Amino acid sequence: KYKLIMLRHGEGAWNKENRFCSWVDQKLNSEGMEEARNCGKQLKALNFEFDLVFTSVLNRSIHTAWLILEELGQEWVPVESSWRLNERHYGALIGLNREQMALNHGEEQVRLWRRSYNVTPPPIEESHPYYQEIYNDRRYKVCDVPLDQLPRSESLKDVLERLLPYWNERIAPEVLRGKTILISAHGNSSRALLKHLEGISDEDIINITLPTGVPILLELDENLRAVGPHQFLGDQEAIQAAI
Amino acid sequence: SKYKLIMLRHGEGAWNKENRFCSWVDQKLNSEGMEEARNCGKQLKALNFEFDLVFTSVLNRSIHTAWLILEELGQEWVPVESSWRLNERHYGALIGLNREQMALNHGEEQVRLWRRSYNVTPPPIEESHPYYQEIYNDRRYKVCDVPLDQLPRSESLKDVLERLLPYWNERIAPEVLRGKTILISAHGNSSRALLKHLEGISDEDIINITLPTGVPILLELDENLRAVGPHQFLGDQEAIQAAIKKVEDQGKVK
């Protein structure tokens, strides 16, 4: 077998204003940082000793890895970041209040826009309050594919399609070669990698519910295909939230 | 063809306040060292620096200094790479001992030579030392470009140069050649050793370079990667000199 840990960061202001962060580089809050600080205390109690850490290019994912590495005393562990682990691009829904988008278009459409393997939201356009903050940022000018070729909106399926090469090419070699890897990612990019490993269907995946601030162990074979459900490590007094 | 590079020294930790030798002991910043980091970041942002790559040692005080600066800059996504080759000088058996006491029992001349000289090697560390095992049993020093038993047990400034220059030649300098803007988060002696090589400083003159903590060091190089003039400090003139008299006074008596 092989082992692998993924997780997702905690809370920010927009995660409390009930808004769509998505590609907006919004930061963690007191509880967001403390959550990851506790998550590292947990992996410490677990005697966890990583070799490589993989993140998105959004800071809430990076501070999360960093705060974790400090609790472990593992700050020298190599870190790699990639747009291909970014949160899903929610197009024009970025930054708007979701409990009032449900007031315009109705719950059924907003629910579908987030619990759907196949549905692409409206594309963010140059008029959007945050179009510039995303596409002009220097971190997207040095990417592996040109600025114009980055998506302006994504389905959950879109996330996996851009993710999977990064897994095949950057990650999978390393998890092959023994390295205990941590993946500090987001709600959808975590959901998509679990699908491709647990072979989840285009219909069971919209059901999958991953907590935040919680390690997610996952065992593999030499095929690198899953061997069981994803399990959650730590003080299993951790069955909270999930709306 | 006209390159710029930023190099700097981390800030205060507990043993710094205690006036001890840290060397390869993985001491953390205290919260004032953390503010030095943040102040570097602010100054770097006020010059609108955009880094493409950051290099550090594997001592966490140099890594945290770097992470703090990236956050000030909004550049947390900029790749970071770390290497024992940028480590502080290994101070042998003086690791953990107070500096002003060393001057009392050996003279300020002997202490100055121990700290700032080119080819005076410290008394090596022995298995008896309270921090021996925690150093050479640390996982970070395992998967390397050098066997565990071959890691030094003390180091002259010259020994530092001989282990740092290969990492410059093969890892930092090519990225400078590509046009990337580089930040180097290291320590007093590893930065002096690379300044000695880049500036061609004599064996006899490197004794007189003291680097202030928490202060950006701007370096300009030509198309052969040699300095164009002497390294320069960013920040207020008088305050840097006052901070420099500070560092050398650590080895002088009442």
Author numbering:
A (entry chain B): 3 to 245
B (entry chain A): 2 to 255
The authors write:
Bisphosphoglycerate mutase (BPGM) is an erythrocyte-specific multifunctional enzyme that is responsible for the regulation of 2,3-bisphosphoglycerate (2,3-BPG) in red blood cells through its synthase and phosphatase activities; the latter enzymatic function is stimulated by the endogenous activator 2-phosphoglycolate (2-PG). 2,3-BPG is a natural allosteric effector of hemoglobin (Hb) that is responsible for decreasing the affinity of Hb for oxygen to facilitate tissue oxygenation. BPGM is a multifunctional enzyme, functioning as a 2,3-BPG synthase, a 2,3-BPG phosphatase and a phosphoglycerate mutase. The phosphatase activity is responsible for the hydrolysis of 2,3-BPG to 3-phosphoglycerate (3-PGA), an intermediate in the main glycolytic pathway.
To confirm the binding mode of 2-PG to BPGM, the crystal structure of BPGM complexed with 2-PG in the absence of 2,3-BPG was also determined to 2.48 Å resolution. The overall dimeric structure is identical to that of the ternary BPGM·3-PGA·2-PG structure. Similar to the ternary BPGM·3-PGA·2-PG complex, the monomer A active site of the binary BPGM·2-PG complex was ordered, with continuous electron density from Ser2 to Val254. In contrast, monomer B was disordered, with weak or missing electron density at the C-terminus beyond Ile245 and weak or missing side-chain density for Arg100, Arg116 and Arg117. The carboxyl group of 2-PG forms hydrogen-bond interactions with the main-chain N atoms of Cys23 (2.6 Å) and Ser24 (2.5–3.5 Å) and the guanidino group of Arg100 (3.5 Å). Our ternary BPGM·3-PGA·2-PG crystal structure shows a terminal snapshot of the catalytic phosphatase activity, with one subunit undergoing catalysis by tightly binding to the substrate (fully closed conformation), while the other subunit binds 2-PG with a partially closed conformation of the active site in monomer B. The binary BPGM·2-PG crystal structure confirmed the ability of 2-PG to bind to the active site and the presence of an alternative noncatalytic binding site at the dimer interface.
